[PDB]
Design a protein around this ligand. Structure first.
Ligand SMILES: [Mg+2]
Ligand SMILES: [Mg+2]
Ligand SMILES: [Zn+2]
Length: 1434
RNA sequence: UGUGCG
């Protein structure tokens, strides 16, 4: 026991670093004799070792004296006001920059999370408090998961730690100086799956848990036999039938009447719409004049780069270099742009860049000519009168202005020459600075309109109509206006008729005319915009939100083709041949409206059309459907949209039209899903937060259980109330009471819960497939205090489970979101894994199972094929109404060694979740406080407002709400899925007991599809009363089991819907608008190739789901146009815009890139393909495999290709074929957005906990408080690509324009641009070694083509290496748009060659795209298939 | 840290 003591002492005395800081601790450590003080000094030394290593690694001065920040700043001579007690482990100063380096070690993930969050909040508080001291402070937190350091090596450190732990055990068994809590904490922090984590926590469950368990067992019988359960179900059904016939229970479903449903839809808003059958021509007339934007879109706005634009661009560029004062520089620049404009006007009588008496200066500013000249005169006079007081020289104001201009231009040229850009690349002409320059500016006068912005709605310059809805002119104008609105967000901050001297502006050209979007506010916020023109000013004025106008920016052709395909869906319908233009017009109008006025109310109105059309083609629908489909509408364009939708519906769903119902259903469903075109982002964050809190709070108030601000330790009143409400939840009566069943009230009946559990227990539901001391411990850098040690019924000793409430924004509103701590997330994950496995043991759940979803799809298709009855069910308020106590009771009453212990732990965790505390958002509390103050100081008084006001009048302010009646939306999702599965199995069993038929159910959390067998369908057709009684009994049973069938659920034989997938007979139902909108809305600020890959994935799934390939090619062209607007060069490896069906079905992304390259250089790819075929045959037998991956893939490129060609007996590519190249801006380093596979492996390996945990946690906490928009993402992408994003070989940062200018300097290199804008360069082989400045940025095209073709051949087969013969004009075929065809995709030694190819080819992610899900089913068009190319092995 | 309408 002392041999290891002497060994450890010798080890530390020999291998300790000889740092002056460690000397005192080493002297203390070695001199120790007693085991206790030896343990203390070993812990001391470890703490100092990690602290000092952290201080030195990050370059900071260690805090040995542990002085406060006050003492540090005062000792360094800087005074600060009083602050909180914060003592960092490390601190350093440089200039005015102060860095604190608080450090810690946590071997556990939950403890690490808690410590990092606490440390970050402490430093944030200190920084906010010191911001008054005018001193910078950037925090750095160094948290490591291990004790390893650079002062002590690994193995001796491990031996020291083990010996210290053994010494601790010895002292605790002998002296017991440490408290058992502190002893356990230190042992845990010294020793360095989740269900067994509850074994080490003390069981402190008192009588509260026993009372809860008794409550969930009281009145429940889970031992009923199948006979007794069947008799009880039969008695319940007979009583229900008798009461339903007598009218005591109201029927929740009605037989579908098409005319009645249409009439209900027509009178949906009959309080202000004083019409029902609107004329289509009058609707067009109203629509073209409804809004200022809509007026501008359909009006008659109709009518060589000049020097003003060149000078504006140059001076815009040189202002970011801060040549320097800001106001002075701005004024000087204004004068130069004015000179350029005057030069243009006197040269060719130009008129661009002017808005009457104001001109377009830098930073998107309108500048008044009068103000410019007065300011220039004042500034020149002031400088002249200042300077001439010294000497007597001719001032010559013109000369003074010229000299200032030359000085500014010289400084700007010097600044630009550093980054690699010369002035001649901006094409600026110095002739604009005439010798007569001052007088020329001061003797300049203009006459024109005065710019104005009308903020209020108190006449139109042009004729309000004339542009036809059929054409694409309206979409083009909307595209230009949307781009201008989005660009208005990029302006940097500078300092009724509202005509102004200076404001901000954006330019756009329409029909050869210049228009200016004028605004007076900067930022990504809603503001007033005014469209103005030089001829007549103030064309229109509106109040748009700029970050809601992204999807239309370059989508004119895409949207037009979307509408055209939708219209072609219904074109052979005979009754709609006369009313075919109107339909088209209506469709267009709806789209245009939702793209010009993107409103949440419009989004929900368009969404509800889906449920209307689903009920229209059904047999039975909920009686409350119509009330749910109606929304409050405020704006007049919303009522116009409703009228247009009503007209379209009444034309499509006319009684005279009965020809092709599947096509009309698809058309109306796509019109409904057009709601995805409107962005899903919140219009107002505070209003949506208020709505989310009301949705969270009203059900609890109706139930009657709301605990207001509960403590971590529960007061006896709160526990008593929780027990009472647990008893109340199971005290739901139904069908055997005077007042009858009360629908939609949360809770379950004891009788029906007993029936469910008994049926599960006896196997009725299964199938054949189943059967000093404390202070120093605190001072330690690795001692853990965040670990829970005991647990009660209310939760762990560390406190009850906290959940922050927020909203996840989506189409049709928001869904509630609960965010917990890491420890709470793991505790919940235990329950989730248990219930996921328990559901996996059974079948019918499609939530997480993927093959089960395919089984459900096949069953739905088979049901629809035979025209059997399908019941598509949504469950309303699945989250808020359903309760963790329900899950606890069900689990306690179910019957399936360690199983009893696992059930006990699960019950404890569910009891924890019962007592969870949800934190009211602080914005909501502040809004309620402001409303309360303004109401009490200065009539609706909503339920939530009444709640807050009642709490405010009695003192305490609500912060946390605890209630039995809530499960987190997505928190207990696997548990909810399991409950839905078992409850619906029991309900189907009861229905099969009652009738003769069976129901096949495929539940998934809240969504569900029930397929009725033949017997039930016959019952519906011949005995409607009994079928309706069965449906009502199903509704009643679901209500008794706390499953409230939504009013949007439908029973019918036409369509089966499940998880947003629709299936009918014969035809397919693609959500074309949904996929097109998803493609148009996903543009981020990632690296451009990543954006291309994401868009390619989206287009791949859209093609697989039935979108025609030409629309997808148009979407790809839209993405390339977005990239071209950022002026990013379009290399041949971004997107392919001439694809076909075979490219997406047979091929993959690599194959599409091969097709693009082969399109670019047809003749240079045949010989490469021949050599590749020879190579593939050589390596198929096994030879040439080992002498190719190491002799050629590592050698220099463009030189080994001829070696391969001569080695395989084929003609090597000629002189010119090697000259083809593409410009790679990431040749040295990836672009700044703020071997590839090797770095990917590194990042994945250093991600989870052992390495990179601190990095990933820092990025997560930085990106948590940073939320942006799609339009904000696009403007950020434009800013980043226009900035210095290109990294040179030596860590330098350059512009893309710098690289382009350096390329343009060399005359040998020539560019070649594709028909779609793809640029590839021909570099003469006479130069690849002389001037290596930018030749290093080029990559030969043939080598990348070879690598990609070889990798594609390995992953897909030899057919990709064959000759691509184009399609042969067979004859003439029908072009039926709804003529689909299903298709299946064509699916160790070569893995090494693949990974060797990927490290060699820095062009595309080849081997890493396997795991990032390949589509296993394609639905394409027969006409599109028969025009695809042929690629066969020969 | 953008000046870019395919
Ligand atoms: Mg410290
Ligand atoms: Mg559904
Ligand atoms: Zn001009």
């Amino acid at each position: 026991m002392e041999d290891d003591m002497a060994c450890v002492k010798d080890l530390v005395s020999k291998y300790l670093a000889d740092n002056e800081r460690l000397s005192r601790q080493k002297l203390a450590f070695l001199v120790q004799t007693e085991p206790r003080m030896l343990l203390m000094e070993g812990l001391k030394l470890l703490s100092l070792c990690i602290e000092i290593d952290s201080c030195n690694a990050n370059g900071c001065e260690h805090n040995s004296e542990d002085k406060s920040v006050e003492r540090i700043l005062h000792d360094h001579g800087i005074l600060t006001p009083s602050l909180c007690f914060v003592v960092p482990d490390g601190y350093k100063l440089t200039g005015n920059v102060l860095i604190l380096l608080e450090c810690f070690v946590r071997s556990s993930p939950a403890n690490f999370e808690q410590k990092y969050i606490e440390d970050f909040k402490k430093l944030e508080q200190l920084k906010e408090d010191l911001k008054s001291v005018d001193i910078n402070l950037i925090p750095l937190i160094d948290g490591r998961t291990s004790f390893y350091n650079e002062q002590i090596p690994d193995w001796v450190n491990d031996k020291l730690r083990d010996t210290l732990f053994s010494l601790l055990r010895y002292a605790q068994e002998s002296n017991s100086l440490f408290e058992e809590s502190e002893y356990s904490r230190l042992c845990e922090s010294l020793s360095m799956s989740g269900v067994e984590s509850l074994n080490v926590l003390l069981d402190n469950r008192s009588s509260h848990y026993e009372e809860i368990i008794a409550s969930c067992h009281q009145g429940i019988n889970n031992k009923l036999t199948a006979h007794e359960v069947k008799l009880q179900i039969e008695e319940e059904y007979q009583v229900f039938r008798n009461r339903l016939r007598k009218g005591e229970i109201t029927g929740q479903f009605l037989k579908v009447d098409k005319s009645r449903l249409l009439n209900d839809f027509n009178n949906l808003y009959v309080d202000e719409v004083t019409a029902t059958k609107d004329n289509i021509e009058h609707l067009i007339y109203q629509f073209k004049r409804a809004s200022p934007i809509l007026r501008f879109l359909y009006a008659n706005i109709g009518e060589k780069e000049c020097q003003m634009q060149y000078w504006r661009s140059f001076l815009n560029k040189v202002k970011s270099l801060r040549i320097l004062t800001r106001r002075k520089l701005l004024l000087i620049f204004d004068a130069l742009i004015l000179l350029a404009s005057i030069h243009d006007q006197t040269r060719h009588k130009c008129s661009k860049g002017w808005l009457g008496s104001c001109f377009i200066s830098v930073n998107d500013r309108l500048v008044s000519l009068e103000s410019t000249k007065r300011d220039l005169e004042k500034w020149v006079g002031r400088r002249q009168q200042s300077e001439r007081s010294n000497t007597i020289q001719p001032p010559d104001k013109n000369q003074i202005l010229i000299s200032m201009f030359q000085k500014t231009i010289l400084k700007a040229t010097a600044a630009l020459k550093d980054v690699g850009i010369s002035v001649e690349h901006y094409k600026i002409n110095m002739e604009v600075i005439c010798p007569d320059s001052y007088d020329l500016i001061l003797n300049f006068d203009v006459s024109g309109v005065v710019p104005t912005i009308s903020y209020q709605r108190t006449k139109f310059p042009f004729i309000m109509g004339g542009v036809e809805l059929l054409e694409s002119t309206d979409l083009e104008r909307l595209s230009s206006l949307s781009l201008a609105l989005v660009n208005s967000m990029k302006t940097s901050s500078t300092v009724q008729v509202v005509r102004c001297k200076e404001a901000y502006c954006q330019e756009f050209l329409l029909s050869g005319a210049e228009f200016q979007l004028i605004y007076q506010k900067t930022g990504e916020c809603s503001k007033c915009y005014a469209i103005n023109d030089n001829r007549v000013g103030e064309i229109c004025s509106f109040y748009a939100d700029p970050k809601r106008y992204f999807p239309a920016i370059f989508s004119a052709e895409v949207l037009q083709t979307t509408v055209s395909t939708m219209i072609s869906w219904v074109k052979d319908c005979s009754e709609l041949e006369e009313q075919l233009c109107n339909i088209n017009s209506l469709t267009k109008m709806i789209l245009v409206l939702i793209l010009a006025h993107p409103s949440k109310r419009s989004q929900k109105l368009l969404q509800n059309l889906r449920y209307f059309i689903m009920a229209y083609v059904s047999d039975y629908h909920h009686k409350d459907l119509i009330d749910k489909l109606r929304e409050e509408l405020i704006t007049d364009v919303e009522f116009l949209l409703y009228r247009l939708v009503r007209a379209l519906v009444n034309l499509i769903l006319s009684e005279d039209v009965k020809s092709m119902m599947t096509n009309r259903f698809k058309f109306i469903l796509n019109i409904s899903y057009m709601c995805h075109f409107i962005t899903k982002e919140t219009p107002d964050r505070l209003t949506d937060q208020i709505k989310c809190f009301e949705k969270f709070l009203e059900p609890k108030l109706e139930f009657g259980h709301v605990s207001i601000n509960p403590a971590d330790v529960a007061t006896e009143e709160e526990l008593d109330d929780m027990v009472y409400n647990a008893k109340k939840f199971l005290s739901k009566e139904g069908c055997t009471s005077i007042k009858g069943p009360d629908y939609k009230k949360p809770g379950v009946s004891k009788r029906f819960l007993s029936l469910l559990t008994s049926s599960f227990n006896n196997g009725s539901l299964f199938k054949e497939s189943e059967v000093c001391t404390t202070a120093m411990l605190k001072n330690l850098c690795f001692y853990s205090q965040e670990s829970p040690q005991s647990y009660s019924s209310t939760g762990p000793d560390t406190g009850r489970l906290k959940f922050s409430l927020s909203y996840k924004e989506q189409v049709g509103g928001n869904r509630e979101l609960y965010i917990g701590d890491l420890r709470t997330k793991m505790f919940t994950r235990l329950i989730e894994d248990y219930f996921e496995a328990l559901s996996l043991q059974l079948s019918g759940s499609c939530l997480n199972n993927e093959r089960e979803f395919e089984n459900a799809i096949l069953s739905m298709k088979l049901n629809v094929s035979l025209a059997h009855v399908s019941y598509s069910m949504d469950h309303s308020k699945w989250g808020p109404m359903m309760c963790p106590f329900l899950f606890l009771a069900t689990l306690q009453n179910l019957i399936f060694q360690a199983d009893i212990k696992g059930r006990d732990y699960l019950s404890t965790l569910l009891t924890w979740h019962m007592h969870k505390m949800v934190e009211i958002p602080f914005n909501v509390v502040s809004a309620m406080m402001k409303s309360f103050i303004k109401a009490q100081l200065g009539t609706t008084q909503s339920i939530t407002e009444d709640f807050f006001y009642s709490n405010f009048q009695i003192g305490v302010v609500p912060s946390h709400v605890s209630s039995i009646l809530d499960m987190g939306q997505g928190i207990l999702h696997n548990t909810s899925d399991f409950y839905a599965l078992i409850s619906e199995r029991f309900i189907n069993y009861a229905i099969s007991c009652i009738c003769g038929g069976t129901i096949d159910a495929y539940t998934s959390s809240d969504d569900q599809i029930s397929l009725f067998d033949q017997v039930l369908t016959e019952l519906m057709q011949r005995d409607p009363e009994e079928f309706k009684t069965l449906i009502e009994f199903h509704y009643y049973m679901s209500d008794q089991l706390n499953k409230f069938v939504s009013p949007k659920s439908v029973i019918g034989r036409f369509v089966a819907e499940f998880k947003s997938r629709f299936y009918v007979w014969g035809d397919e139902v693609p959500l074309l608008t949904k996929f097109v909108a998803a493609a148009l809305h996903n543009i981020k600020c990632k690296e451009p190739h990543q954006l291309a890959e994401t868009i390619d994935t989206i287009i791949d799934q859209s093609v697989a789901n039935g979108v025609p390939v030409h629309l997808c090619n148009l979407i790809q062209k839209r993405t390339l146009s977005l990239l071209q607007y950022a002026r990013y060069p379009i290399d041949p490896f971004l997107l392919n815009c001439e694809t076909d069906v075979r490219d997406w079905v047979d091929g993959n992304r690599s194959y599409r890139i091969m097709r693009q390259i082969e399109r670019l250089i047809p003749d240079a790819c045949g010989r490469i393909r021949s050599m590749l075929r020879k190579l593939y045959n050589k390596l198929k037998t096994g030879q040439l495999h080992e002498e190719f991956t190491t002799n050629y893939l590592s050698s220099e490129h463009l030189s080994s290709l001829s070696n391969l060609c001569e080695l395989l007996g084929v003609e090597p590519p000629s002189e010119s074929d090697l000259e083809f190249s593409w410009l790679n801006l990431a040749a040295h380093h990836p672009l700044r957005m703020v071997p590839t596979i090797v770095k990917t492996i590194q990042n994945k390996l250093s991600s989870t906990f052992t390495r990179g945990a601190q990095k990933l946690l820092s990025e997560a906490i930085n990106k948590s408080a940073f939320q942006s928009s799609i339009a904000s993402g696009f403007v950020g992408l434009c800013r980043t690509l226009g900035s210095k994003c290109v990294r040179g070989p030596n860590k330098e940062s350059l512009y893309i324009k710098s690289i382009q200018s350096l390329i343009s300097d060399i005359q040998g290199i020539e560019p070649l641009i594709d028909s779609h804008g793809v640029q590839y360069w021909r570099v003469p082989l006479n130069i690849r070694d002389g001037n290596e400045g930018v030749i290093s940025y080029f990559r030969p095209l043939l080598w990348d083509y070879m690598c990609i073709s070889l990798s594609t051949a390995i992953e897909l087969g030899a057919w990709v290496l064959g000759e691509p013969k184009k399609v042969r004009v067979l004859e003439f075929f029908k072009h039926n748009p709804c003529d689909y065809f299903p298709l299946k995709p064509a699916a160790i030694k070569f893995l090494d060659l693949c990974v060797a190819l990927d490290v060699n080819c820095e062009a595309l992610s080849l081997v890493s795209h396997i795991v990032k899900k390949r589509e296993e089913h394609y639905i394409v068009l027969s006409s599109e298939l028969r025009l695809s190319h042929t690629r066969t092995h020969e």
